[PDB]
Amino acid sequence: KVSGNYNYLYRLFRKSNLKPFERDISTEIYQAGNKPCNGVAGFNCYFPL
Amino acid sequence: QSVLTQPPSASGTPGQRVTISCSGSGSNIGSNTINWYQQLPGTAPKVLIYRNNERPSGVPDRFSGSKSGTSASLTISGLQSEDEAYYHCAAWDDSLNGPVFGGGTKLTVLG
Amino acid sequence: VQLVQSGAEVKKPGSSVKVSCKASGDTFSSYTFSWVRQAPGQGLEWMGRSIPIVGKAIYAQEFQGRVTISADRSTTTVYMELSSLRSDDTAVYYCARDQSGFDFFYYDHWGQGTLVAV
Amino acid sequence: KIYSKHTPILVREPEDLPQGFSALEPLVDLPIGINITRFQTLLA
Numbered sequence: 070k071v072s073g074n075y076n077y078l079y080r081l082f083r084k085s086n087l088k089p090f091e092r093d094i095s096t097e098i099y100q101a102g103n104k105p106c107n108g109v110a111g112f113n114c115y116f117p118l
Numbered sequence: 119q120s121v122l123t124q125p126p127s128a129s130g131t132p133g134q135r136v137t138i139s140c141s142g143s144g145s146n147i148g149s150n151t152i153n154w155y156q157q158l159p160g161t162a163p164k165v166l167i168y169r170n171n172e173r174p175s176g177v178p179d180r181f182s183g184s185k186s187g188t189s190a191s192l193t194i195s196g197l198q199s200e201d202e203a204y205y206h207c208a209a210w211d212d213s214l215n216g217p218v219f220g221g222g223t224k225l226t227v228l229g
Numbered sequence: 230v231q232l233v234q235s236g237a238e239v240k241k242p243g244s245s246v247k248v249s250c251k252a253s254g255d256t257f258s259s260y261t262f263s264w265v266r267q268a269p270g271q272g273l274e275w276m277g278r279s280i281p282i283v284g285k286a287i288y289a290q291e292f293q294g295r296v297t298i299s300a301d302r303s304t305t306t307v308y309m310e311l312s313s314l315r316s317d318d319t320a321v322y323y324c325a326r327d328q329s330g331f332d333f334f335y336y337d338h339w340g341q342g343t344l345v346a347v
Numbered sequence: 348k349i350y351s352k353h354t355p356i357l358v359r360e361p362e363d364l365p366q367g368f369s370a371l372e373p374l375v376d377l378p379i380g381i382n383i384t385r386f387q388t389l390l391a
C-alpha cells in the first residue's frame with residue numbers, strides 16, 4: 070500500500086526447527102541467554118515474531 | 119515551521135470558489151500524492167481528499183484537488199457557512215521517510 | 230469508531246506527558262492509533278506510529294527516542310509518553326485509526342484529542 | 348485416521364476379551380495437525 074505494508078509477520082526465534090506443515094499460534098518471548106525471563110520482553114529474550 | 123507551506127487564511131463570499139495552495143519539492147509532492155484534511159473549529163479533523171482524486175462518498179463534488187509537479191491546489195468551491203475550517207496538506211516524504219503536513223489555512227465565511 | 234482519548238493535561242515544563250487512546254467498537258489487534266500534534270499556526274505535525282501486534286513502533290525523525298508509544302491489546306489502548314517538555318511542546322495530541330489494509334497506513338479518523346499546555 | 352469395528356452379542360461376560368479374530372475397517376481421516384501426546388476418555 071502507499072503507506073507501505075507492515076502487517077505480514079514472520080518468526081525469527083524458535084526453540085526448535087519445525088517439521089513440514091507446522092503452525093504455532095502462541096508468540097511468547099523466546100529466551101536467548103542463560104537467565105530465564107518471565108512477563109514481558111527484555112534482556113536475553115526478545116519477541117520471536 | 120512545517121515543511122509544506124500553505125496560506126495562513128483564505129476567505130471568500132458564500133457560493134464563491136476558494137483555492138488553497140500547498141508548495142514544496144518533488145521528494146514529497148512530486149514523488150508522493152498530496153491529500154487535504156479539514157478540521158472544523160472545536161472538532162476532530164475529517165478526511166476531505168486523499169490521493170488527489172477519490173473522496174469518502176459524503177464529500178460533495180465541490181471539493182476537488184489537483185497536483186502539478188511540486189505544487190498542489192484544493193478548489194473547495196461552492197463556499198457555504200460551514201466551510202470555515204483549518205485545511206492541512208499532507209504527503210509522504212522520502213527524505214524524512216514519514217508523513218509531513220502543511221501549515222494550515224483558516225477558511226473564512228464572509229458576509 | 231467511537232475513538233476514546235484522555236483529557237487535557239497541563240503538568241508544566243520538566244514534568245511528564247500522559248496520552249491514552251482507547252479503541253472502542255472495533256478490533257484493536259488490527260487497528261492502531263498513530264500520533265499527530267498540532268503546533269498553533271503550524272498545522273499538523275507527525276510524531277509517530279504504533280503496531281499493536283509484536284510491539285514495533287516508529288517515531289518522528291525530528292523527535293528523539295524520548296517519545297514512547299506502546300499498545301495494550303487486552304485493554305485495547307495506545308499509550309504515548311513524551312519525556313521532553315518545553316514551550317514548543319504545547320499542542321493538541323490526536324491519535325487516528327490508520328485507514329485500512331490492516332490499519333497501519335495513513336490517517337483517517339482522529340479522536341477528540343488532548344490539549345497539552347507547557 | 349480412525350478405523351472402527353463392532354462385534355455385537357458378545358457372550359464373554361465375566362472379564363476377559365474373546366479369543367477371536369477380526370479386522371478394523373477404515374472410517375475417518377482428517378487433517379488436525381496439532382501436537383498430541385496425551386489423551387483421555389469421556390463418560391456420559
Ligand SMILES: *[C@@H]1O[C@H](CO)[C@@H](O[C@@H]2O[C@H](CO)[C@@H](O)[C@H](O)[C@H]2NC(C)=O)[C@H](O)[C@H]1NC(C)=O
Nearest residue numbers: 084085086087088091092093381382383384385
Ligand atoms: C509436543 O508436546 C510434548 C509434550 O509437552 C513435547 O515433548 C517434550 O519434548 C522435549 C524434548 O525436546 C522434552 O524435553 C520435554 O520434557 C517434553 N515435554 C514433556 C511435557 O515431557 C514436544 O516437544 C512437543 N512438540 C514439539 C514439536 O515441540
